[PDB]
């Protein structure tokens, strides 16, 4: 919400904001992660299976 007002001479305005966010990540890394686990798949093996 962002409003200004002039009465004068004098001006007063005000910007106020709220911002939310909720992230979920598919972790990466050298461990038991999803991509490092995906790439280590033989070419003959069916992933979606």
């Amino acid at each position: 919400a962002r409003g200004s007002h002039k009465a004068g001479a004098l001006t007063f305005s005000s910007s106020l904001n709220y911002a939310y966010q909720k992230n979920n990540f598919a972790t990466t890394g050298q461990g038991l992660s999803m991509l490092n686990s995906l790439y280590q798949t033989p070419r003959d093996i069916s992933i979606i299976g």
Partner: protein, 84 residues
């Protein structure tokens, strides 16, 4: 449309157990009897399927191989050597 659906078949291995001794020794003329065997494939007794390669001459002073094959080829084997 996706492409790479798994194409596998689930094959069920035979389970073949042994009766008696691995090595057996006899005297010339003392006939060979079969100690026995047990074979199992998907819980279904298939012992009558078991092939025994070779034989054992009792009058010539011998190794026998028992195998059991499932429905895709994969076998389970064991040897029985016999001497005279």
């Amino acid at each position: 449309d996706k492409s790479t659906d798994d194409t596998s078949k689930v094959t069920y291995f035979v389970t073949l157990e042994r009766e008696g001794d691995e090595k057996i020794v006899l005297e010339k003329g003392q006939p060979f009897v079969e100690p026995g065997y047990y074979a199992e494939m998907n819980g279904e007794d298939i012992t009558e399927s078991v092939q025994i390669k070779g034989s054992v001459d009792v009058n010539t002073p011998y190794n026998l191989v028992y195998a059991a094959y499932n429905e895709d080829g994969f076998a389970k084997t064991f040897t029985r050597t016999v001497y005279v």
